[PDB]
């Protein structure tokens, strides 16, 4: 069926970051952190419509043999069903490594690349990712990069089935367990 | 809540410091000698003695309450200061992993030496004439 | 771990010092002659410095505890590593008992 993604987002200045990580190692599951390092690139298809189609492709540079990942994110639902999280339609697809070449045949062109380097935790269904967004200049190269800002970004995400309430309330409680350190909230993608 | 408990600790600390300072200042103020008028020296002196003793007792009580506050703060730190729990868990994990690895290296070397001895004994026993 | 706890231990000792400085100051004031009035001023400054830095340390630690409190019971643990270490030690003990038995049968064979 059609699965929905619930998002809460925020940010954290880096000099307080470690305390956040220590807080997360208390609250999230009994695991060591994951330290993911990913290359993300955004393709778009300039169809007839006013809205061009958008697709996100991620190659996990750090882990060899990890399948590439496609993600289609639907536009956010204006209905006030879950009032507190970004509720979107998510289609996530594991793929082989010729993907970009295949997408070049489908009519897609690139928009921007960015590295993302950070940590990954989980709590039940929830996925906490705390990462820094790295701008790539010299667009072919993945080493020539610069940090976008001083702050790290924090995302609390749950991918789950369409509708399916009592999900955003648990995300509210897990966000409120961090509220001195981070302010996580449903931020609209407009402006 | 945690916020409520921390506020309560702040209130207790402020109250204890205020009480010690007030009692000491009041003892010092009574220590002033003043000229008497309608107070009957003897009564004034006993009342002053009682006041000083009671204030000293109050100062000692405030010190005991400060000791209680320190103990409660120590308990809170030992129970839910997340960083130190993480360093304790990690140090415990690394120490136990090193002990496990030492035990397994000892066992593997034991197995190899015992296997060589078993080979010699098998040759001797099976090739025995009897 | 020893850092903040040793701070709490120091504040215990300084609460004792505050009470003793109160007592020493009124000790000097009760004297028939108290010549060392400069030392009375020194003990008074010692008393007030003790009370002030006790307040400073405890206020700082309540602030730091406000920064790292969560009200949640810390779901981390170290149980699995202790379990594996116990199994490794019992493997070693089993091998020790078996080696004792083999050595005992060897002594019985060589004994005759």
Report DSSP letters for A8-34, one per residue.
EEEEE-GGGHHHHHHHHHHHS-S----
The 8-class DSSP code of residue A67 comes to: P
Of the CA atoms within 13 Å of residue B77, those in its CB half-sphere come to 22
**End-to-end alpha-carbon separation of chain A, Å?**
31
Chain A hits for C77, Cβ within 8 Å: 30
Who contacts C27 (Cβ-Cβ below 8 Å, separation ≥6)? none
Q: Do C71 and A177 touch (CB under 8 A)?
A: yes
Q: Do C72 and A27 touch (CB under 8 A)?
A: yes
Contact partners for chain B, using 3 or more CB pairs closer than 8 A, are A, C
The 3-state secondary structure of chain B, one letter per residue:
CHHHHHHHHHHHHHHHHHHHHHHHHHHHHHCCCCCCCCCCHHHHHHHHHHHHHHHHHHHHHHHHHHHHHHHHHHHHHHHHCHHHHHHHHHHHHHHHHHHHHHHHHHHHHHHHHHHHHHHHHHHHHHCCCC
d(CA A161, CA A151): 32
d(CA B70, CA B13): 9
Resolution (A): 4.4
Distance (Å) from the alpha carbon of C2 to chain A's nearest alpha carbon: 18
Distance (Å) from the alpha carbon of A4 to chain C's nearest alpha carbon: 28
Instruction: Say if residues A51 and A138 touch (Cβ distance below 8 Å).
Output: no
User: What is each CA distance from A167 to A7, A87, A88, A91, B75, in whole angstroms?
Assistant: 11, 11, 14, 19, 35
Contact partners for chain A, using 3 or more CB pairs closer than 8 A, are B, C
User: What is each CA distance from A146 to A51, A117, A131, B26, B91, in whole angstroms?
Assistant: 30, 12, 14, 65, 35
Domains for chain A: give ranges and CATH numbers.
3-177 (2.40.320.10)
d(CA B21, CA B59): 9
Q: Which residue has the tokens 């993907």?
A: A99
Q: Which residue has the tokens 């600790």?
A: B9
Q: Which residue has the tokens 């380097």?
A: A117
d(CA B96, CA B108): 18
Task: Pick the residue from chain A with its C-alpha nearest to B1.
Answer: A177
d(CA C1, CA B87): 9
The vertex-A94 CA angle with A171 and A43, nearest 5°, equals: 85
Who contacts B58 (Cβ-Cβ below 8 Å, separation ≥6)? B19, B23
- Tell me, rounded to whole angstroms, the distance of Cα B107 from its chain centroid: 41
The 8-class DSSP code of residue A177 comes to: T
Sign of dihedral through CA atoms B101, B102, B107, B108? positive
Chain A hits for B83, Cβ within 8 Å: 19, 22
Distance (Å) from the alpha carbon of B70 to chain A's nearest alpha carbon: 24
Of the CA atoms within 13 Å of residue C38, those in its CB half-sphere come to 0
Instruction: Say if residues A130 and A12 touch (Cβ distance below 8 Å).
Output: yes
Chain C hits for A30, Cβ within 8 Å: 75-77
Who contacts B124 (Cβ-Cβ below 8 Å, separation ≥6)? none
Sign of dihedral through CA atoms A11, A16, A20, A25? positive
């Amino acid at each position: 069926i059609n699965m929905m993604e619930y998002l809460l987002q925020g940010s954290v200045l880096d000099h307080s970051l470690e305390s956040l990580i220590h807080r997360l190692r208390g609250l999230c599951d009994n695991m060591e952190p994951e330290t993911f390092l990913d290359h993300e690139m955004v393709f778009l298809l300039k169809g007839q419509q006013a809205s061009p189609f958008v697709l996100r492709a991620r190659r996990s540079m750090d882990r060899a043999g990890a399948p590439w990942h496609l993600r289609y994110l639907g536009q956010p639902e204006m209905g006030d069903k879950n009032r507190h999280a970004l509720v979107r339609n998510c289609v996530d697809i594991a793929t082989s490594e010729n993907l970009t070449d295949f997408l070049m045949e489908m009519g897609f062109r690139m928009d921007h690349e960015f590295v993302a380097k950070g940590h990954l935790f989980r709590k039940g269904i929830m996925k906490i990712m705390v990462y820094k967004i790295f701008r790539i200049l010299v667009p072919g190269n993945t080493d020539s990069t610069e940090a976008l800002s001083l702050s790290y970004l924090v995302e609390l995400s749950v991918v789950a089935p369409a509708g399916q309430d009592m999900v955003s309330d648990d995300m509210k409680n897990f966000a409120e367990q961090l509220k001195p350190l981070v302010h996580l909230e449903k931020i609209d993608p407009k402006r | 809540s945690k916020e409520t408990l921390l506020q309560s600790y702040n209130k207790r600390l402020k109250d204890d410091i205020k009480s010690i300072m007030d009692n000491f200042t009041e003892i010092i103020k009574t220590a002033k000698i003043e000229d008497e008028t309608q107070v009957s020296r003897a009564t004034q002196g006993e009342q002053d003695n009682y006041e000083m003793h009671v204030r000293a007792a109050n100062i000692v009580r405030a010190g005991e309450s400060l000791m209680k506050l320190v103990s409660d703060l120590k308990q809170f730190l030992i129970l839910n200061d997340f960083p130190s729990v993480n360093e304790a868990i990690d140090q415990r994990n690394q120490q136990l992993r090193t002990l496990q690895e030492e035990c397994d290296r000892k066992l593997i070397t034991l197995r190899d030496e015992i296997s060589i001895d078993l080979y010699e004994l098998e040759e001797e026993y099976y090739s025995s004439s009897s | 771990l020893a850092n903040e706890r040793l701070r709490a231990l120091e504040d215990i000792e300084r609460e004792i010092g505050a009470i003793l400085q109160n007592a020493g100051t009124v000790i000097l004031e009760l004297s028939k002659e108290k010549t060392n009035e400069r030392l009375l001023d020194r003990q008074a400054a010692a008393f007030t410095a003790s009370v002030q830095h006790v307040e400073a340390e405890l206020s700082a630690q309540i602030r730091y505890l406000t920064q790292v409190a969560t009200g949640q019971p810390h779901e981390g643990s170290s149980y699995s590593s202790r379990k594996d270490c116990q199994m490794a030690l019992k493997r070693v003990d089993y091998a020790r008992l078996k080696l004792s038995d083999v050595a005992r049968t060897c002594e019985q064979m060589l004994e005759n």
